[PDB]
Design a protein around this nucleic acid. Structure first.
Length: 96
DNA sequence: ATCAGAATCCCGGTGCCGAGGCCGCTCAATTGGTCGTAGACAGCTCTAGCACCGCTTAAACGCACGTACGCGCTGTCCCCCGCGTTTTAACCTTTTTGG
């Protein structure tokens, strides 16, 4: 599989097919889906790292939307990235 | 009815084939940088004054804190219905002594 060749866990074939069927360009090079999969995997790893930290901070072993909201709004770079999104059941940060 | 497990089929991966998109080189010449001189309106330094921001006092009145009462999403009382057995009716049948 093309994920194994790149040492990845995200799919390369699926992403290539979505880029192909998304009406983005006439043709798609072979180095774009690998790079994009790597970026997405890095970003999800960062998100899940901070959300797991936030869930342990609450002494829970399973991540809920509240911990995702806390991880997002507590990280400056992520909170700047996800500045317009609202998370259902995410709540708000404690701020008086 | 969702969740876990068995069977298979279709979509990701291998194989091979073609055509062109784009990399590369080379050439043109526009425009962007670079400087220099001259002019003068704009910036600036400063002075001076006052008006507006900020602190302080007062008033009150209208939100919060609190106890008493209100209301449409959920608990009791009943208008409505299909269906049962019943009540009521028009009808048919049979026979009218013995010798």
């Amino acid at each position: 599989t093309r994920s194994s060749r790149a040492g990845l866990q995200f799919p390369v074939g699926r992403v290539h097919r979505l880029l192909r069927k998304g009406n983005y360009s006439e043709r798609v090079g072979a180095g774009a889906p690998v790079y994009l999969a790597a970026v997405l995997e890095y970003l999800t790893a960062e998100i899940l790292e901070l959300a797991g930290n936030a869930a342990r901070d609450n002494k829970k072993t399973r991540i809920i939307p509240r911990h995702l909201q806390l991880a997002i709004r507590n990280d400056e770079e992520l909170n700047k990235l996800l500045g317009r999104v609202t998370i259902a059941q995410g709540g708000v940060l404690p701020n008086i």
